């Protein structure tokens, strides 16, 4: 547990939700300050501690690192700040990022997801808004509030209650059977790639999640973004394989992105 007296919070929020807010701050560690992002809040306490419990178990260059929890005026989860922020907003404001640079970033996300898959955690909210840029050439996955540690004997998490879900990033098996696996995250990764090569445009613009579900049941998918490399559009379509068993895992997806990235230059 962190000492609230060593944490200073800035006023401007990096994000918000029903839980509360995410704000920038500075945390005095031993001899220096660390720039941090802090999630600030009966059930929510448990969820935040669960979220922290997930981040505590993860250690990978492409996942946001948790500093710790701090109980003060409210419950806080202190994380290392990825100062460039969400990938979708960054590309919206920086339309001249090169396709090669986007490949590098999404490949980095796939390395982090490959690690998550190996560790047997499902993210359940993979999306461009939850890819944070440390630099224009270094991305980290964030926002583990919906993440679950899979049981040693199962390869999916079965949701009891359908809450407010990010339907546009979810695979059909999630929507129809409440079943969440690493392959479900692979589907989300495809949507994420689409967002990335579309410079942070929203997926399925103007459609209700229910209309997205119906479109996908018809075998229809989002089109190729302007200027998106063919091989990357092809990878998206592979990620959007309806049948979970035929859809690739992150091991395969990362390898494909690695080979393509290394082949550019
Ligand atoms: C627009 N700008 C310049 C910035 C910059 C940084 C962040 C930021 C940096 C984080 N770093 C580490 C951990 N969390 C973080 C965070 N969290 C918010 C959330 C909200 C909801 C979606 N995902 C992200 N935001 C947000 N905006």
Swiss-Prot record:
Signal peptide: none annotated. Widely expressed in hematopoietic cells (at protein level). Expressed in neutrophils (at protein level). Within the B-cell compartment, expressed from pro- and pre-B cells to plasma cells. It is found in: Cell membrane; Cytoplasm, Cytosol. The modification Phosphotyrosine is found at residues 1, 115, 138, 156-157, 177, 260-262. Ubiquitinated by CBLB after BCR activation; which promotes proteasomal degradation. Residues 8-262 form the Protein kinase domain. The active site is at residue 125. The modification Phosphothreonine is found at residues 21, 161, 213. Changing residue 261 to F: Loss of interaction with BLNK. Disulfide bonds: none annotated. ATP binds at residues 14-22, 39. Belongs to the protein kinase superfamily. Tyr protein kinase family. SYK/ZAP-70 subfamily. Non-receptor tyrosine kinase which mediates signal transduction downstream of a variety of transmembrane receptors including classical immunoreceptors like the B-cell receptor (BCR). Regulates several biological processes including innate and adaptive immunity, cell adhesion, osteoclast maturation, platelet activation and vascular development. Assembles into signaling complexes with activated receptors at the plasma membrane via interaction between its SH2 domains and the receptor tyrosine-phosphorylated ITAM domains. The SH2 domains mediate the interaction of SYK with the phosphorylated ITAM domains of transmembrane proteins. Some proteins like CLEC1B have a partial ITAM domain (also called hemITAM) containing a single YxxL motif. The interaction with SYK requires CLEC1B homodimerization. Interacts with LYN; phosphorylates SYK. Interacts with RHOH (phosphorylated); regulates mast cells activation. Interacts with NFAM1 (phosphorylated); probably involved in BCR signaling. Interacts with VAV1 (via SH2 domain); phosphorylates VAV1 upon BCR activation. Interacts with GAB2 (phosphorylated); probably involved in IgE Fc receptor signaling. Interacts (via its SH2 domains) with CD79A (via its phosphorylated ITAM domain); the interaction stimulates SYK autophosphorylation and activation. Interacts with FCRL3. It is linked to Immunodeficiency 82 with systemic inflammation: An autosomal dominant immunologic disorder with onset in early childhood. It is characterized by recurrent infections with various organisms, and multi-organ inflammation that manifests as colitis, hepatitis, arthritis and dermatitis. Patients have a propensity for the development of lymphoma, usually in adulthood. Disease severity is variable. This is Tyrosine-protein kinase SYK. The lineage of its organism: Eukaryota, Metazoa, Chordata, Craniata, Vertebrata. The gene is SYK. The chain holds residues 364 to 634 of 635 of the full protein.
């Amino acid at each position: 547990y962190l000492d609230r007296k060593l944490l200073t919070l800035e006023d401007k929020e990096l994000g918000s939700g029903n839980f509360g807010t995410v704000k920038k701050g500075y945390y005095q560690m031993k001899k220096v300050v660390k720039t941090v992002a802090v999630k600030i809040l009966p059930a929510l306490k448990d969820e935040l501690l669960a979220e922290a419990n997930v981040m505590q178990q993860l250690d990978n260059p492409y996942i946001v690192r948790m500093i710790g929890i701090c109980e003060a005026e409210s419950w806080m989860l202190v994380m290392e700040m990825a100062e460039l922020g969400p990938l979708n907003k960054y590309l919206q404001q920086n339309r001249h990022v090169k396709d090669k640079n986007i490949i590098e970033l999404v490949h980095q996300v796939s390395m982090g997801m490959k690690y998550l898959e190996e560790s047997n955690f499902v993210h359940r909210d993979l999306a461009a808004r939850n890819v944070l840029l440390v630099t224009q050439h270094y991305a980290k996955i964030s926002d583990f509030g919906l993440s679950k540690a899979l049981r040693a004997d199962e390869n999916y998490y079965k949701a009891q209650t359908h809450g407010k879900w990010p339907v546009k990033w979810y695979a059909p098996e999630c929507i129809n059977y409440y079943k969440f696996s690493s392959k479900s995250d692979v589907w989300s990764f495809g949507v994420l790639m689409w967002e990335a090569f579309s410079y942070g445009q929203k997926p399925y613009r103007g459609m209700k999640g229910s209309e997205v579900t119906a479109m996908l049941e018809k075998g229809e998918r989002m089109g190729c973004p302007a200027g998106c490399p063919r091989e990357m559009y092809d990878l998206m379509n592979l990620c959007w394989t309806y049948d979970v068993e035929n859809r690739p895992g992150f091991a395969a997806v990362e390898l494909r992105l690695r080979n393509y990235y290394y082949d550019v230059v």
